[PDB]
Design a protein around this ligand. Structure first.
Ligand SMILES: Nc1ncnc2c1ncn2[C@@H]1O[C@H](COP(=O)(O)OP(=O)(O)O)[C@@H](O)[C@H]1O
Ligand SMILES: Nc1ncnc2c1ncn2[C@@H]1O[C@H](COP(=O)(O)OP(=O)(O)O)[C@@H](O)[C@H]1O
Ligand SMILES: [Mg+2]
Ligand SMILES: [Mg+2]
Lengths: 528, 528, 88
């Protein structure tokens, strides 16, 4: 194989701890208010200016192999916390460094690091079982705004924007962030059924306005496969002209022959029609056209095992929509007379379909179909002047959004580190089975103080003194590091998701208590 | 990944500030009259000789990684200002260096850089809200000449040329600058409907002059697709010969058969005809031929839905034009009897079509159609003797043109830096919420003096003394650095667009106040 | 004469500079003021001098000016410089 190099004991431990200390000192400055950004050189363009604890962690890679091992084992913690909770990365990294440092001190010749790991895991379980006891659900719409404000680095505009977007879409709706172009932030609630696809021929525009085809009380002809010939298209247009109502033709495509017939009828005698293609690549459109049909009320033509053809249509076989807008890039149906008692059955079908499976993309478009059929979708356009500002503010907005979505499902708990400091009395009743589990419980009991200490440190005050005066205080009092004083929390409005706190703690403890059990380190020699 | 290197605190700040200072000292010499060019080595040919603050900024790239980070964060400022306003790059870069320098001095252990950023942004908002109050619209045609003269580095010929081009085309017309060939500048006003495409066969020339086909009161046959056979071409020529008038044949192309028929009828019986291909290369031609038709009055043949076959034409189906000139590379129709009441509807259609969308190329050809259909288009052929002279003078002309186009939409304000010096009393009423926002407001209050100071510095006098004696003076008095004395501004004729001033200030403040919040810098190893 | 007229402003400028303020602005506002008014860089404001108690010997001022001007105006007259090689 490749020439390798082994290091034993305290040397390898010291190098791994140096790497962890470097990668955790680079990120620990970002914590809390008064924390500070980190400029990462991008290999091609302008650099990133971050405050998150994964970009700062996923970027830092060390030259030395052992320091690099430490850096990788901390990046694993940061990335696991990011994926599992969306937030809690800096806290996870500082907890990991604390458990690693406290781990490479009790490893004597008689100490059993595996039993120390077992004690650490008992302590982590006993503390995440206390977080769930001191937690409380988020009910009022002010708590959502508060969580969004806090997780947005104290940006109250972000909090109000996210709270508004969650009031008009639902606490489990579909909010999404985009690179805005204006100077401020904007909340755009796409309402009704909208798909990113416009009319085919630019002759259907009857608006004398901003390039729109606008219909009221229109019919809908939903075709799965192409409408090629003049034969298939004529009966639907006959029905439309006889009833004297506009017609939208949502199909896979309108061939040049039927297209020519439609445009011809438009420019002369003036049947009111407009045509558009399907929303989704192959399979998604198959379900999405059916959703549109049952939302407006009708039948998709050309289905595989249904045997419905265009040649035999009827006025009760076409969908009915109150208002239709078709621009050059997107079509919006608004008021579908689609027998709500059945669209509700469809909604139950799709919610069960999400509850069954998960692929991070099937569930994505699945939730898209929920929101596109029940209550809109919100989009947050982040204001900014350059790309680096927009990227930083968009990262903060996505973090606040992940936090607000992690609070509504698993409750809130006190913030500023107090959620963990208020769990030390839980560890003070554990009876360790032996000396090693006692050592692990003590490691966790020390590590639970790291977050409040690091926040007070970044605030420019003495951390340990603040943590002590907090633990001496009541249960609802703690430290506001912006005002810099002791306040009630829920009255003042500092809270955090229990999910993010518990996932950060658990991931940090898990990776660090396994790093601390090492005795030999094997690294490939660097050739050049 | 790649082996990286992290630097913390004052070291990283010092290196990034060195990079910013280098990239801003290279560009600060270019400011104002008495400012000086910069010779940039081109990798392939003769070097550039610039005075703009983006070529000098986009060129400079530093060896060291941290200096390079500073240089990139200043290039972003210059480039954003260039894209958003077309001018204001040197000012934006000097403001960015001032804000960065004033930012890397107040960062003590207790100072909160994010609150300093917030205070800086409040100050920038309060000052751009004062620029808009002390502004005033540009109304007389002498203010346009003045703005063009000033932004052209005080070249009055450029100002008069741009003012003339804007009087004969409209303040929102289509002016464009080209590399001239003569020694002087030239204003060429392409009038009527002209497209860069000449006759097909060199037998239609009936001029006995400079290779031109010249018709008076001619018919126009507009065909979307090719005219292949003699069958389709014969009836139009029958109508033309019967009425005894010339005929122009604007089609996608003239096949060899109809072409041979045309050339034969031209050479043997001397029938007056001339043929040309369509102007638009692709989809654009389908709209441009329709525009030409409605401008002259007729129907484009071969349209998809408006079938209108060539075989059934009539004398009212052909366009009519007063004068036609067709050379070997361009055709010009001049006086189209096109029922102006309908071409006005077309103009409204195309103006709404620009108001709807934006792609930097669809809007480009869109405005091209507006100008080519309403009041022609002006071109500015810049003189010069070598390519480097022509390039420098062309850059100055494009900057003067961008300035004049940014002044006519958002008003003018005093110049020489006085626009910003007259905004400090606005900052003198801000009540900062805390100490950090107060620090930010003070940073902006110091930064607002940088432009007048740098101009007086380049003029060879004491900057700060000039700025002080300006602030002591009245509201309309300021410093003329060419005459070198204090004068009224609008009376003497120094003004700048409020858009360029506000965009430069806002972009500089935005990028600099985010650079100043950094605590750690991560850069890839320079390996080789 | 113009070189000396520019050089006479250097001391007040350097004092205002070390005090953390703008030197040239202070020198200008001093030259605009009366003959007994000047700048106190500790209190940082304009005061009468003998009333406030700032004075210097004319001997030290004149000797400093004369020695500086003398050596500098001879340094500025050079055209060639000859230096021993730095061998090792
Ligand atoms: N005013 C505040 N006072 C005390 N703690 C705060 C305050 N604002 C935010 N925090 C705490 O800082 C953390 C949120 O920001 P941050 O330090 O970046 O953590 P993360 O890396 O997980 O996003 C939470 O622990 C939060 O409770
Ligand atoms: N005679 C003048 N006197 C004072 N300021 C002037 C004069 N001419 C131009 N300026 C100022 O110089 C700037 C225009 O040229 P320049 O310094 O290169 O700025 P930019 O890089 O944005 O083009 C403006 O601030 C303008 O007000
Ligand atoms: Mg967070
Ligand atoms: Mg300019």
């Amino acid at each position: 194989g490749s020439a390798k190099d082994v290091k034993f004991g305290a040397d390898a431990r010291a190098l791994m701890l140096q790497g962890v200390d470097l990668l955790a000192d680079a990120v620990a400055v970002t914590m809390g208010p008064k924390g500070r950004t980190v400029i990462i050189e991008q290999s091609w363009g302008s650099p990133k200016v971050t405050k998150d604890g994964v970009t700062v962690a996923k970027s830092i890679d060390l030259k030395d192999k052992y320091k690099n091992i430490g850096a990788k084992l901390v990046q694993d913690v940061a990335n696991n916390t990011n994926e599992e909770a969306g937030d809690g990365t800096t806290t996870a990294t500082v907890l990991a460094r604390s458990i690693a440092k406290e781990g490479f001190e009790k490893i004597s010749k008689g100490a059993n690091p595996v039993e120390i790991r077992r004690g650490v895991m008992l302590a982590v379980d006993a503390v995440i079982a206390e977080l769930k006891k001191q937690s409380k659900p988020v009910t009022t719409p002010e708590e959502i705004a508060q969580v969004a404000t806090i997780s947005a680095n104290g940006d109250k505009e972000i909090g109000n924007i996210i709270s508004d977007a969650m009031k008009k879409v639902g606490r489990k709706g579909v909010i999404t962030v985009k690179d805005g172009k204006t100077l401020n932030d904007e909340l755009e609630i796409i309402e009704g059924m909208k798909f990113d696809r416009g009319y085919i021929s630019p002759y259907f525009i009857n608006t004398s306005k901003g390039q729109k085809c606008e219909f009221q009380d229109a019919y809908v002809l939903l075709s799965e496969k192409k409408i090629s010939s003049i034969q298939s298209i004529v009966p639907a247009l006959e029905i439309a002209n006889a009833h004297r109502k506009p017609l939208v033709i949502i199909a896979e495509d309108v061939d040049g022959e039927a297209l020519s017939t439609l445009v011809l009828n438009r420019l002369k005698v003036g049947l009111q029609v407009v045509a558009v293609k399907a929303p989704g690549f192959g399979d998604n459109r198959k379900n999405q056209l059916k959703d549109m049909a049952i939302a407006t009320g009708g039948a998709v033509f050309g289905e595989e095992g249904l045997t419905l053809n265009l040649e035999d249509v009827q006025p009760h076989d076409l969908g009915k929509v109150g208002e239709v807008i078709v621009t050059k890039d997107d079509a919006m149906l608004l008021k579908g007379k689609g027998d709500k008692a059945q669209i509700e059955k469809r909604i139950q079908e799709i919610i069960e379909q999400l509850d069954v499976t998960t692929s991070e993309y099937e569930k994505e478009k699945l939730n898209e179909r929920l929101a596109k059929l029940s209550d809109g979708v919100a989009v947050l356009k982040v204001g900014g002047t350059s790309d680096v500002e927009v990227n930083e503010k968009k990262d903060r907005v996505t973090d606040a959004l992940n936090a607000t979505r992690a609070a509504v499902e698993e409750g809130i708990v006190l913030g500023g580190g107090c959620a963990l400091l208020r769990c030390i009395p839980a560890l003070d009743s554990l009876t360790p089975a032996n000396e090693d589990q006692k050592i692990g419980i003590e490691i966790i009991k020390r590590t639970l103080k790291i977050p409040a200490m690091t926040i007070a440190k970044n605030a420019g005050v003495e951390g340990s003194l603040i943590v002590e005066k907090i633990m001496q205080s009541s249960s609802e009092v703690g430290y506001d590091a912006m005002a810099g004083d002791f306040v009630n929390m829920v009255e003042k409005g500092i809270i955090d998701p229990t999910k993010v706190v518990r996932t950060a703690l658990l991931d940090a403890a898990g990776v660090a208590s396994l790093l601390t059990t090492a005795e030999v380190v094997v690294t490939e020699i660097p050739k050049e």
